[PDB]
Amino acid sequence: GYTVAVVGATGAVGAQMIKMLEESTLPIDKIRYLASARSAGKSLKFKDQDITIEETTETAFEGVDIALFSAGSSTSAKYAPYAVKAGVVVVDNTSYFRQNPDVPLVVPEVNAHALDAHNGIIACPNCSTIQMMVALEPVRQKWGLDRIIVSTYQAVSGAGMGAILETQRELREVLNDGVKPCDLHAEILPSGGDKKHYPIAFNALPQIDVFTDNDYTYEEMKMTKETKKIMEDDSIAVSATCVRIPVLSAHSESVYIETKEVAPIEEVKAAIAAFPGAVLEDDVAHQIYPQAINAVGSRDTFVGRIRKDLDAEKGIHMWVVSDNLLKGAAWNSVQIAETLHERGLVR
Amino acid sequence: GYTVAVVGATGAVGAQMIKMLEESTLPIDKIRYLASARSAGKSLKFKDQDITIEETTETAFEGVDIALFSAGSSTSAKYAPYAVKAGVVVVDNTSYFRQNPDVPLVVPEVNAHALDAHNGIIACPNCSTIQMMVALEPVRQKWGLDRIIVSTYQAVSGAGMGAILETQRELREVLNDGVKPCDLHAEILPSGGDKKHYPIAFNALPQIDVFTDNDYTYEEMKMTKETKKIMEDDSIAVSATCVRIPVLSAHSESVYIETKEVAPIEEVKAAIAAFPGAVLEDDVAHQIYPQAINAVGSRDTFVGRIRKDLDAEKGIHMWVVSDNLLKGAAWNSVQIAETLHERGLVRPTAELKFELK
Numbered sequence A: 001g002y003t004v005a006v007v008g009a010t011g012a013v014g015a016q017m018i019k020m021l022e023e024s025t026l027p028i029d030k031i032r033y034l035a036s037a038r039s040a041g042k043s044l045k046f047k048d049q050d051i052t053i054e055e056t057t058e059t060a061f062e063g064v065d066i067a068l069f070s071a072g073s074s075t076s077a078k079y080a081p082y083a084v085k086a087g088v089v090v091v092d093n094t095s096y097f098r099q100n101p102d103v104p105l106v107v108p109e110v111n112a113h114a115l116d117a118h119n120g121i122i123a124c125p126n127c128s129t130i131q132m133m134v135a136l137e138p139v140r141q142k143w144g145l146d147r148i149i150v151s152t153y154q155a156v157s158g159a160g161m162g163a164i165l166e167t168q169r170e171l172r173e174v175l176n177d178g179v180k181p182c183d184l185h186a187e188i189l190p191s192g193g194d195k196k197h198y199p200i201a202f203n204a205l206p207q208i209d210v211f212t213d214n215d216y217t218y219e220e221m222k223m224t225k226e227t228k229k230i231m232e233d234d235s236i237a238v239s240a241t242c243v244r245i246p247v248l249s250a251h252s253e254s255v256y257i258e259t260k261e262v263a264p265i266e267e268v269k270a271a272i273a274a275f276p277g278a279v280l281e282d283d284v285a286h287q288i289y290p291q292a293i294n295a296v297g298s299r300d301t302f303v304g305r306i307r308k309d310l311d312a313e314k315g316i317h318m319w320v321v322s323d324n325l326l327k328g329a330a331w332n333s334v335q336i337a338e339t340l341h342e343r344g345l346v347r
Numbered sequence B: 001g002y003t004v005a006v007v008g009a010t011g012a013v014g015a016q017m018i019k020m021l022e023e024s025t026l027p028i029d030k031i032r033y034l035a036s037a038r039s040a041g042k043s044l045k046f047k048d049q050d051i052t053i054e055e056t057t058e059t060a061f062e063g064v065d066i067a068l069f070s071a072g073s074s075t076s077a078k079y080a081p082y083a084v085k086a087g088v089v090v091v092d093n094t095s096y097f098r099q100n101p102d103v104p105l106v107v108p109e110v111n112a113h114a115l116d117a118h119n120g121i122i123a124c125p126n127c128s129t130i131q132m133m134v135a136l137e138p139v140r141q142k143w144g145l146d147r148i149i150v151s152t153y154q155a156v157s158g159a160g161m162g163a164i165l166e167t168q169r170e171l172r173e174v175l176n177d178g179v180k181p182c183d184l185h186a187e188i189l190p191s192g193g194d195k196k197h198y199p200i201a202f203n204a205l206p207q208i209d210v211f212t213d214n215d216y217t218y219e220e221m222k223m224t225k226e227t228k229k230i231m232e233d234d235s236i237a238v239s240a241t242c243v244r245i246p247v248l249s250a251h252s253e254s255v256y257i258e259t260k261e262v263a264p265i266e267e268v269k270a271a272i273a274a275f276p277g278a279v280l281e282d283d284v285a286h287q288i289y290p291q292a293i294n295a296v297g298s299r300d301t302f303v304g305r306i307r308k309d310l311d312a313e314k315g316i317h318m319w320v321v322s323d324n325l326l327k328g329a330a331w332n333s334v335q336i337a338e339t340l341h342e343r344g345l346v347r348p349t350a351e352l353k354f355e356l357k
């Protein structure tokens, strides 16, 4: 079997990477947990075994077959090249390598073939992108995609363990102490890397990541650019609004598309139901639609509220929900690793 | 001055109608508070005065000049026509009369002229529609509107006191008692009138109101139909997704439009800033944008994240936030009443045009 390293083992995604690896079909002979110097020497479980956390260094990857990076774009930029030079296959959860033309950007149900071209690094897309691609690829295949407009409803776990804890504390202050939401102290959200921090409790923050020069955020632009690369079609117009809401896990998305050919709604529903990784949950007569609280803990992407636009012949609206730490991150990464093993690409 | 009645004085909107009337420019000689028989006989304040709550009945409107209704569409259907018959001018904050061609459907900054033709009932639009109209009217005036696609992020107060209390209870059960959100018991949300109820705590529910036969909800279709009427243009294409989130008050909206002519994006910002009732809050270099928690308690509607679509020449995206109990309900209604007073329109109607139930 393989020696597998999890870089960022101690964080929100890393905890789920451990769970997904424990549950994986990858033959794992040895597991290593890497994080920063401040976590080094502590212990975490792999199944019933205690694993000592190691500091991530330029020389830490000797003997490793597969390294799953989920420690921030900075850590991947710094250490992933050293891992690759040591002969490790890197699956990177971060944004750093995603737009590199020599790096496959993969959702296995959509573009697993792109893995065949890897040169030691495979990038996992952003969580919001991944779930949208699972919902939309079956439609693209049959009727084409001309454009996408999406508004997201993103859970705080996407911003890390600290953001989860900040959200819980803020909510308790309002509910238990009677603090007005606008009076709350915040330190992390909307973006740890930006200058000002705002409460998320009882709020909706229209900022994920930092702003780019075109006044879309980096998160919005990641959805645009990653979609084009994954679907291998720069002609698909994509514009996004990405919003943080007071949900701990599971992202929801209000997705509008226009197809190239008119796609009958009942056929769209069937095509989505038929697509691996997508689950149709759509029966409005019984108030059945995807819900964040029900999606948590599942690797599936759930799609419903599917309906024609009221005016645009080729327009369709839908609602897409998935656990942002599973299909949006740790499960997509472990699924990549399993696909590399299955296809003889761990080399 | 006037005798003013508030129908539904004891609920979420009614509390704000009281506040907005206490702060209004209406000359008020006498206030009456109406609600159900359960509440009748109890007392609520107007300023320092104790007001005895009355039962809403066909005979409760004698001597009333203006009545603000916010007690459910059924209550308005049943009693507003009797108030009109008694000589009252009704400002109705329910959906019931909104699509009646004899009823102006008004946001005062947008279409106050429609008040001139009233027949005793003036309808306040749905909260989601109102804030979107305040943001979009200045754009429409200059560059036109071809279509709107909107996804909403709606606060629980929109669904009433019970929904607020349910939300608070659920969050406490999760955060203090360790209940998993999927194990929570709900009784009200997403829709009190529908068959199944789901938790809102740590959730996003893509259902507001019941479903219609075209698979859009009544809320989504209200946005569509009300927009066309308020803007007096059935050619404006509007499709909506309306979603409840765990916010107590203030609705937010991700709004996409295509204009008829290209609208320079900085001029769009300027036009919105210049429009009464809309406040431009848009400086992304300093992370300035509208936020629900900051909008609560303000009558203004806040607009930012204003930016061009990446591909559609005439496409524009923005983020619109307003307090759904103030501009979305009680303030729009009181503002309508003030506008009626100012324009000499508080007068009994000559002919009854509304069905008596």
Ligand SMILES: NC(=O)c1ccc[n+]([C@@H]2O[C@H](COP(=O)([O-])OP(=O)(O)OC[C@H]3O[C@@H](n4cnc5c(N)ncnc54)[C@H](OP(=O)(O)O)[C@@H]3O)[C@@H](O)[C@H]2O)c1
Pocket (backbone or CB within 6 Å): A007, A008, A009, A010, A011, A012, A013, A014, A034, A035, A036, A037, A038, A039, A040, A056, A069, A070, A071, A072, A073, A075, A093, A094, A095, A124, A125, A126, A127, A128, A157, A158, A159, A160, A161, A162, A324, A328, A329
């Ligand atoms: N696909 C996606 O959309 C997606 C979603 C979420 C996250 N991610 C990626 O995963 C990263 C972590 O996310 P998270 O939610 O798990 O964050 P988190 O809960 O804050 O955890 C951060 C992790 O990174 C480690 N780390 C920080 N600085 C490090 C350094 N200099 N060297 C080695 N390790 C370091 C931390 O270890 P210590 O405990 O030792 O500090 C911790 O394990 C993100 O920054 C992002 O790039 C991707």
Ligand SMILES: NC(=O)c1ccc[n+]([C@@H]2O[C@H](COP(=O)([O-])OP(=O)(O)OC[C@H]3O[C@@H](n4cnc5c(N)ncnc54)[C@H](OP(=O)(O)O)[C@@H]3O)[C@@H](O)[C@H]2O)c1
Pocket (backbone or CB within 6 Å): B007, B008, B009, B010, B011, B012, B013, B014, B034, B035, B036, B037, B038, B039, B040, B056, B069, B070, B071, B072, B073, B075, B093, B094, B095, B124, B125, B126, B127, B128, B157, B158, B159, B160, B161, B162, B324, B328, B329
């Ligand atoms: N424009 C908008 O978007 C908007 C927004 C929110 C609400 N509204 C309208 O306002 C209504 C109330 O909303 P809310 O949030 O204030 O709800 P709420 O907190 O549940 O309050 C309901 C109010 O309606 C009264 N009521 C119920 N049954 C009645 C009856 N048979 N006769 C007279 N009054 C009765 C209640 O009186 P008791 O206390 O005596 O039961 C209470 O005053 C909604 O149903 C809707 O039609 C409009």
Ligand SMILES: O=C(O)c1cccc(C(=O)O)c1C(=O)O
Pocket (backbone or CB within 6 Å): A072, A073, A074, A093, A094, A095, A096, A125, A126, A127, A158, A159, A222
């Ligand atoms: O670097 C980060 O701190 C980060 C945090 C959350 C999500 C992402 C991402 O692009 O998926 C990223 C990222 O890799 O840019």
Ligand SMILES: O=C(O)c1cccc(C(=O)O)c1C(=O)O
Pocket (backbone or CB within 6 Å): B072, B073, B074, B093, B094, B095, B096, B125, B126, B127, B158, B159, B222
């Ligand atoms: O009657 C309701 O149950 C209701 C509840 C919340 C908002 C509205 C509304 O459209 O103003 C309505 C409504 O009047 O339709």
Ligand code: NA
Pocket (backbone or CB within 6 Å): A145, A146, A147, A235, A236, A237
């Ligand atoms: Na296209």
Ligand code: NA
Pocket (backbone or CB within 6 Å): B272, B273, B274, B275, B276, B277, B278, B279, B280
């Ligand atoms: Na203004």
Ligand code: NA
Pocket (backbone or CB within 6 Å): B341, B342, B343, B344
């Ligand atoms: Na006058």
